[PDB]
Symmetry: C3
Subunit: 145 residues, 3 copies
Amino acid sequence: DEELQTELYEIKHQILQTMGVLSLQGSMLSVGDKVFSTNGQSVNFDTIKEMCTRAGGNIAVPRTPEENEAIASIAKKYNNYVYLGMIEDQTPGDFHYLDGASVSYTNWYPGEPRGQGKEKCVEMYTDGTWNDRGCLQYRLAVCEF
Amino acid sequence: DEELQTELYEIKHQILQTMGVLSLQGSMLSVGDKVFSTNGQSVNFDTIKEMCTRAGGNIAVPRTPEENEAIASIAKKYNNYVYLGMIEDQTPGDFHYLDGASVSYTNWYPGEPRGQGKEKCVEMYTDGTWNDRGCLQYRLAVCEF
Amino acid sequence: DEELQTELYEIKHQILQTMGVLSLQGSMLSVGDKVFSTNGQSVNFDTIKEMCTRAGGNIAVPRTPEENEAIASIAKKYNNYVYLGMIEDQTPGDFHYLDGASVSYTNWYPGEPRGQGKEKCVEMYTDGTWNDRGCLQYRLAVCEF
Ligand SMILES: [Ca+2]
Ligand SMILES: [Ca+2]
Ligand SMILES: [Ca+2]
């Protein structure tokens, strides 16, 4: 009806106001349909995954250059490396998203992936490039929604 | 129409992104259809009620074990007791929600309600159990929306 | 349909919960259909405009007494003056919103606008009244959404 068109407009406006506020305050970065955010904590991979799922999201993983740059800006902001949502396959060198699917977009630092002790996790340097490492380090927790 | 199904999906996604961000940042706890949040202030009952209504919510009151535990986690988090949304009836011993209705779910500390000077308000200990007290103490303000 | 009426209700509830949380935490002030918010930064006019647009909003401009008072409360809160969304016309004395339209609601401090060196920008004193000044000062950035 006509009353429906009105309600949707207000609802859309309100969402746009709340997201604008969170953005202005630096609580989140929006890229396309994805929203990235961090709780400022620096913990290991398992802990990050838990924190994000508990917040109703998932450990962040860039799938485009723009997404990768948004996460990179957060890592730079906190002067810390970020663990990404991906892990090495059974056969070293290959990586897959946490759902199993194989990674498509990649931004490895030159020479990487270079598995010392079978580097299973992936960290993002502050310049945005990736390094495959182990998963017990303390890294900035960044989630995507 | 079909364009309507699309709009609703995006709107639902966005809300889920903003709530995810607030959750990740510890600004609010969601339990079922209820959201709890605190402004970190420790003031008396009247002041808490005003703050919550002014924010478009109400002084929190647990109606299920899960809700009670969520509030308890916030009280523990701030290492302070929380005033709950309920007050003693005209006849001591009985308590009612702020709308008048009688309390159903209760989690009194053993021995409570124990009205010294006609304990009218109800505070939540950090372990989640309740104690009926007076209303002039300074307690953590927790609201529900 | 009937399932639509239900979805809208939940969506409206959720938005009301997120806005309630932001309000309680002092992250934003709602006035009618307008939301004001600040990132706590004190920068010049050009910088403020950029910050707000980047957040999906615009440098704040009061169009009613109530809106003016809400912004005034924020300026008082941070003990700093706020640059408003308006600039002086080609012919001194006249001011227009950033879209070109001429200002309607005004709250000039007695004697203002008083253009010393052709005061082009407008700042809000902590009492809510306005003073036309230059645009290079460092003022609290307040956006509207
Ligand atoms: Ca490596
Ligand atoms: Ca007692
Ligand atoms: Ca002047």
